[PDB]
Amino acid sequence: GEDGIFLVLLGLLMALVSWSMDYVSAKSLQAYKWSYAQMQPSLPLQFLVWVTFPLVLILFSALFCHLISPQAVGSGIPEMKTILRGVVLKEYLTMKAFVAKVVALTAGLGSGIPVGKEGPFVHIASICAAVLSKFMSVFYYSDILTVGCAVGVGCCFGTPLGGVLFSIEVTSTYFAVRNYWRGFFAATFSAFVFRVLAVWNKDAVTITALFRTNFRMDFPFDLKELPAFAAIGICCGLLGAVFVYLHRQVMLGVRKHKALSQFLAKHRLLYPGIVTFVIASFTFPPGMGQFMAGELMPREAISTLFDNNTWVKHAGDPESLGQSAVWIHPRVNVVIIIFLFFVMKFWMSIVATTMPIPCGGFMPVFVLGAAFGRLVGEIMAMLFPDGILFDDIIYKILPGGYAVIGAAALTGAVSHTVSTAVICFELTGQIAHILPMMVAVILANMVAQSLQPSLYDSIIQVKKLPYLP
Amino acid sequence: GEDGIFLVLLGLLMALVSWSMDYVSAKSLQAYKWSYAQMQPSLPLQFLVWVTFPLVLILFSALFCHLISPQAVGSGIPEMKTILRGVVLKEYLTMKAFVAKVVALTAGLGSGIPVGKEGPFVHIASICAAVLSKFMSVFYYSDILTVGCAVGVGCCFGTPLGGVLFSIEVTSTYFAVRNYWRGFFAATFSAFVFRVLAVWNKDAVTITALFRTNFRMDFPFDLKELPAFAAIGICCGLLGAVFVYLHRQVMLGVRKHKALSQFLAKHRLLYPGIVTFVIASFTFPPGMGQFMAGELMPREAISTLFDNNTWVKHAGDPESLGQSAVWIHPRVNVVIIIFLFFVMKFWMSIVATTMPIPCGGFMPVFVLGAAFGRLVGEIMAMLFPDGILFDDIIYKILPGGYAVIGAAALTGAVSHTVSTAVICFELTGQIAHILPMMVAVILANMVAQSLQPSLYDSIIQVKKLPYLP
């Protein structure tokens, strides 16, 4: 009927918005790197620019989520999964919030602070679905929200079927397969237009997925290492649980005492600002980024962590690798700097997503999972030096695969879902490690579902929304 | 709770059954090839053995679906998708049919006649689910059938998430996500045990998917060829529709007249037997297999059609390729033999799946799709000789990708579903062509949903089961 025209118009209007915002964010971020390099090597000057650019940009984003729309702070998927369980929120789906959010999500992304991308984008995709429906036939409600969620995540990442699985498996109890067909149609069209546009205007020469990895697909892994994958199941789930626990121990920590509540009511934007300050103090590269690999914005950080070469063995030479040359210090072994990167981005991510900013809880958790995966992969490669044999040719293990297993498993354990593995392999561009990441996702899910509740369940519990089951 | 023990026991019991039956079928089929080669080149003797082995084995399978269980003929998914819409069939889920079906599906598969594998396997997986539940807690119903369907197709092909999508998207109207989690768990465990067992006992050296393809993943296809994919959408959908139409024009063709009904009631097993005969008459390789590539059992036939080299250009030399050397005739161009293979397996497949045998409608449709795909790929490679340029290196197109697009799209158009692309790329082992196969699956679905009904809908219409919507 007249469903196809509405769905194709939603897809073509969502791809341009996603492409525009990350185009602008990428140009702002490379201008940041450019100016920071190109002034001079002056260590106080480097500190002051490396601090004053993210404070300006994050306080700008907090200003445009405070001023225009007072209801879009703390946004993302948990209040809309509260909405589709029956509760209506009338003023919350206003078009005026839309322009109030997108520009904030630009200025949440153009800095190197770990935030999400998915959550506010799911919200604005639902906004565009509702507005385009209300404009339609003036010249069904949970259907509109489910199609909005599918188009939102499948237009974030160019991952259609991971989009429709992410819409069904957490934001529902029953599900009409009419929405399955509609969400699959609109999500694959949005992911189609978003990827071909980066060949038209910019240069990404073909319809490569987003983050390709050149693994070898000829004996990737034997079953002599397979219980190691069991470890990267279980520990990730355990680590995922601790994340959720500590998240609540900051949320209530904002609201536990009258003193800091009076301090925040004295001036609202002071809480993001200074804490932006302190994580800039641990990201300055000659300050502590030597011990940290601090000079990595997160997109190229996880393009780096999915590399196809062993970092312990290429440390005997000063050979120029890609960006991964920042992962070599002349005094410290690389296992220690992966360890410190993991622990400091781990406590940095919770306090980064705590602040009153449009936040998603997917991307920094994905980065933490990749870091833990490559940690256990590098100690596997250090433990078994020779590799094993094949027809007069030697195959040695490679730790990019461990990184992609961990970057599926830990965010699957945090967000209490099994469909994270789908967008994981659909971002990485290869499915060589597919059933080990499914087994690891399921082990991490059963451990992190035994111990603690989900992330979004804790958010709706602390924010105290009407949530009946 | 006590769900995990039941699901892991179902998975480990289903993997052994699938592995055992295709182990036995593969050994029988290679013994067929072995004896046929190893007697002598005597052209009447070759004819008589090439005919008398499939007649014996197919009449044996028809005997063991006629004798023990009189209710398991015409089995597969459409009567069970009738069952889960409300209608009960009491005597149909008896354990006695289980042993009556599995051995038949061995002797439906050990011959080279095109049959399915999925349908009767979904049925026996539901049988094992129900029996293991009734044995459980003596020392929920649609849940048991949906878990049975997911384990069935994900244990056929080692494809978990394509399994759970194949269970939701056609055999439901609503869907409880409890069954999503259970089906995902049990399907990935079944696909895990099935693939690692082929390294323990037999040799498939690692957890390679099933049918790997070595494409190049470095500029697979430009967007200068992309409307060709539009053609392999639309035509496949049109061709898929014709398949369904002709299928009904044989089913009613059995039941249109009293004469052939009296002829069949005279002797029931005569109808499969002789028609097995006639397709053997068009598969004898010096008879007509020169013009046909007849000496290809279907599994190695579609391992051949997914090859990474151009068949027009490697015809100037008598170089030994793999099995694909059967695709070269010294007098006939290869486009004509792909064309004749397609048209003769097209009319052969409907009459092959017509006969009273446990049949699935997935595998021969998959083969027909691969043949049409490589047809349009070879004429694309014949049309554009030079390829195009890159950094002083030339990239020419390769027609394996067209074959895998067509083998997704035409069976997606026949079975009226979008989740065929998932098991397509999960069998082929690479996701380089993923969003073109999604776009082609959706174009073929909208054309073949405009023209004719589904395959299984026509089956339940002609068999006249109680089907309310």
Residue numbers in the entry:
A (entry chain A), B (entry chain B): 115 to 253, 262 to 591
Please quote the paper that reports this structure.
The first identified human member, ClC-1, is essential for maintaining the permeability of Cl− across the plasma membrane of skeletal muscle fibers, gCl, accounting for approximately 80% of the resting membrane conductance and assuring precise neuronal control of muscle contraction. Despite distinct roles as passively conducting Cl− channels and stoichiometrically coupled secondary active Cl−/H+ antiporters, members of the CLC family share a common homodimeric core architecture, with each subunit harboring an independent ion translocation pathway.
For structural characterization, sample in the presence of 100 mM Cl− at pH 7.5 and in the absence of nucleotides or antibodies was initially employed. Three-dimensional (3D) classification of particles resulted in several different groups, of which one yielded a 3.6 Å overall resolution density map for the transmembrane domain, allowing confident model building. In CLC transporters, the Cl− conducting pore is marked by distinct Cl− binding sites (denoted sext, scen, and sint, respectively, but no Cl− ions are resolved in the current structure), and the constricting Glu232 (of αF, also known as GluGATE; ClC-1 numbering throughout) and Tyr578 (of αR, TyrC). The pore aperture of the extracellular vestibule is constricted by a hydrophobic barrier with Met485 (Met427 in ClC-K), but in contrast to ClC-K, the gate opening is also controlled by Lys231 (of αE–F) and Arg421 (of αL) that may orchestrate Cl− permeation to or from the extracellular environment. This difference can be attributed to αE–F, with its GluGATE and Lys231 adopting a more CLC-transporter–like configuration because this loop is considerably shorter than in ClC-K, alongside a side-chain reorientation of Arg421.
